[PDB]
Amino acid sequence: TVFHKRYLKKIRDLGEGHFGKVSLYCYDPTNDGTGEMVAVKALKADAGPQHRSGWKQEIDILRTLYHEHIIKYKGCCEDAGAASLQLVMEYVPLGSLRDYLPRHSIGLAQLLLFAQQICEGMAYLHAQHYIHRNLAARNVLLDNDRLVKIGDFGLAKAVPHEYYRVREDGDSPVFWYAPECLKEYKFYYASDVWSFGVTLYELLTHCDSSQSPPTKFLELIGIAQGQMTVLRLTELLERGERLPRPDKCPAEVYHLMKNCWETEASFRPTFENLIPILKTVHEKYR
Ligand SMILES: O=C(Nc1nccc2[nH]c(-c3c(Cl)cccc3Cl)nc12)C1CC1
């Protein structure tokens, strides 16, 4: 599919993606305002050869993924300004779970349905042989109060092999990362399950920033540490220390969370394992 830049009417900026920014447009070929509202992802113009090869990878990943709990790719556009392409996605107006949950009081049942949907989308992603590497509430879009979709794929990679070797990066979401990613710089399919546990914790805390993984971990570690945040994080996780049980979170749900956080990656449930578990848990509390 292809969109004409000539009919893209900028409305506002949505935020920052990994290789550039996300912007809201009205694609209006008839010029009457009835046009579809689209979310467009662009390559930041001053990007080097490294950020450009990474952007082409994300484009390719996004134009092949089709799942009901994964953001719908619409097509592309020629970005004459950055001499590349602009990724046209469906606009999800209610936004991210990180933005939505602290402003709307969502019940336990719905939060579990969201977790179930994240798993459905993630089991599909793993079957397509890709790892997400950035599974967080921030990257989960709410289509409606009963429908959630994985919305960002900036750090997503193809697994040829059960793990991918990651680079020592400063933009890595370390507070959502398994010990083997921090220690060995290896990202397994199971590493994505650790992140789901963290995403699940964020939902049961309603994305309250005072209860957030960075706030919680940086209270435990402290900030007197000189270039030793990741080391202390790896160390506290080895000691078996974890983020606490969110208020009013069911006991067995916290057990599932703690199981997604097994130090040994092999002892963590797959995304396929979690789908029947979460369907049952959602039914029990609905
Ligand atoms: O931005 C909105 N919806 C969105 N619709 C469609 C696509 C969207 N991509 C994002 C988004 C942004 Cl900007 C930054 C980090 C992670 C993500 Cl996932 N948000 C998207 C809502 C709030 C207006």
Side-chain angles (χ1 to χ4, degrees):
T1 327
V2 64
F3 291 84
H4 303 287
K5 184 65 187 270
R6 345 190 261 93
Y7 304 121
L8 286 162
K9 276 93 175 175
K10 199 178 184 193
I11 284 159
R12 63 161 190 278
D13 294 293
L14 297 181
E16 293 286 338
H18 193 244
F19 305 101
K21 63 184 189 175
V22 193
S23 294
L24 174 59
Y25 289 85
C26 179
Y27 190 69
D28 201 31
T30 61
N31 202 39
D32 57 11
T34 68
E36 266 272 38
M37 268 170 96
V38 289
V40 179
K41 203 171 186 165
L43 184 268
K44 189 153 90 188
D46 68 295
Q50 70 293 322
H51 280 102
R52 282 180 176 267
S53 60
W55 170 238
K56 285 169 164 68
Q57 284 187 70
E58 184 189 2
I59 280 168
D60 292 343
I61 287 168
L62 279 159
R63 69 206 280 149
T64 74
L65 297 173
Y66 303 103
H67 193 265
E68 83 156 318
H69 304 296
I70 281 168
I71 194 173
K72 202 194 87 178
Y73 167 83
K74 297 257 260 178
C76 279
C77 190
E78 74 148 303
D79 191 355
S84 60
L85 294 167
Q86 276 187 118
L87 239 30
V88 181
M89 300 288 147
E90 58 158 335
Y91 174 53
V92 181
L94 298 168
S96 95
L97 279 179
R98 185 197 188 80
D99 294 45
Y100 191 91
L101 300 168
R103 287 157 180 91
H104 307 78
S105 60
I106 295 293
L108 173 67
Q110 291 165 269
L111 291 173
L112 298 173
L113 177 64
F114 296 167
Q116 187 206 297
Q117 294 168 344
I118 299 157
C119 295
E120 286 186 67
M122 283 304 302
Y124 164 80
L125 184 70
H126 288 185
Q128 298 314 112
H129 296 268
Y130 295 112
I131 42 161
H132 198 278
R133 292 166 69 208
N134 202 359
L135 190 61
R138 186 185 270 162
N139 297 310
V140 183
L141 307 176
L142 189 125
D143 196 83
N144 63 65
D145 72 321
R146 303 299 157 118
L147 184 58
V148 114
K149 297 169 157 173
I150 298 149
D152 197 270
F153 291 91
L155 278 323
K157 260 300 305 196
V159 179
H161 296 82
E162 91 271 57
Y163 82 90
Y164 167 79
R165 218 174 223 120
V166 306
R167 57 203 69 81
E168 307 163 346
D169 202 67
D171 244 304
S172 289
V174 302
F175 297 116
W176 280 252
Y177 273 12
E180 71 272 5
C181 313
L182 310 171
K183 226 171 95 190
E184 292 181 306
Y185 302 93
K186 294 185 174 80
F187 201 104
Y188 300 78
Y189 287 122
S191 302
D192 264 339
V193 169
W194 177 287
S195 302
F196 165 68
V198 185
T199 301
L200 183 60
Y201 168 88
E202 290 189 273
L203 304 207
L204 283 324
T205 64
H206 290 83
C207 290
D208 177 3
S209 60
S210 79
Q211 285 184 85
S212 74
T215 292
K216 250 44 229 276
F217 287 126
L218 287 166
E219 260 175 83
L220 262 189
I221 295 159
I223 61 165
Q225 307 294 296
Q227 196 170 3
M228 274 170 182
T229 308
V230 168
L231 177 102
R232 248 44 158 125
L233 176 58
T234 310
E235 280 179 357
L236 68 83
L237 297 164
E238 290 284 341
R239 290 197 293 277
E241 295 164 42
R242 299 291 184 269
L243 298 157
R245 185 187 65 83
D247 211 88
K248 281 282 195 281
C249 172
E252 55 177 16
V253 177
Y254 191 53
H255 298 154
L256 180 162
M257 261 169 63
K258 280 185 131 281
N259 182 222
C260 289
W261 301 321
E262 289 291 336
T263 295
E264 222 161 293
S266 63
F267 302 169
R268 312 209 280 250
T270 57
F271 275 118
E272 271 169 24
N273 290 161
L274 293 155
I275 303 158
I277 289 162
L278 290 162
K279 280 186 182 162
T280 300
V281 181
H282 165 246
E283 262 302 290
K284 176 180 170 169
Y285 300 96
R286 76 122 190 97

